[PDB]
Structure of Eukaryotic translation initiation factor 4E:
Amino acid sequence: IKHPLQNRWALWFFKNDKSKTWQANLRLISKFDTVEDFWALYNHIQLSMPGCDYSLFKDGIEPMWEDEKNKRGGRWLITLNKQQRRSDLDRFWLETLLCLIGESFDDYSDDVCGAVVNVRAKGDKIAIWTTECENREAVTHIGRVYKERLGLPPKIVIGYQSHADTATKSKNRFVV
Ligand SMILES: Nc1ccc(C[C@H](NNc2nc(-c3ccc(Cl)c(Cl)c3)cs2)C(=O)O)cc1[N+](=O)[O-]
Ligand SMILES: C[n+]1cn([C@@H]2O[C@H](COP(=O)(O)OP(=O)(O)O)[C@@H](O)[C@H]2O)c2nc(N)[nH]c(=O)c21
């Protein structure tokens, strides 16, 4: 009676706490693998924050660089301005979630690991994480479709960063 998704997904929370090492602040909330259970979760949280993150990742992949499926990967990063938290954040996040659970990138959705939203005073961020940063055709395909899906204007780019680079930041591998 329920409608299965192609993948099982897990929702993670992150609570900012500078007094603790980063991994200590991560919390696995719940998992789902049907359309019905996705909306049940989404609707519940909408009815029910700064410094914190939400992450939706395929089952078995933790939302961190250290994970085997993220180690060699990277992310398409969308940076919002401060006004867009009110206007665009919720729309962008839901549209991103639907890209994930609806496998919107066709054959290349296999490269998708998950998505993360950072709530930050400096400007909120939404990102789609993929598994191999050197996989140009997959990465660029995901970027092009994702940018279009969120309705972003052509000339202004979004960037793809390697996690290996982000982890050693003291730069983009791709733009779309
Ligand atoms: N790392 C960490 C450390 C401490 C806490 C506890 C705490 N807040 N917990 C909270 N849970 C929800 C919450 C959860 C699930 C659903 Cl379904 C809904 Cl509707 C709301 C909102 S607020 C606090 O403020 O100290 C939390 C975390 N963490 O990462 O989640
Ligand atoms: C995604 N991520 C973030 N951090 C740590 O979290 C810090 C901030 O990460 P951020 O919250 O993504 O960026 P922000 O500066 O806008 O808040 C980074 O300097 C990293 O040290 C991370 N640390 C580990 N070990 N693994 C991760 O996946 C990871």
Q: What stands out?
A: DSSP finds five helices and eight strands in the chain. The chain has one domain: 1-176. The first strand starts at residue 4 and ends at 14.
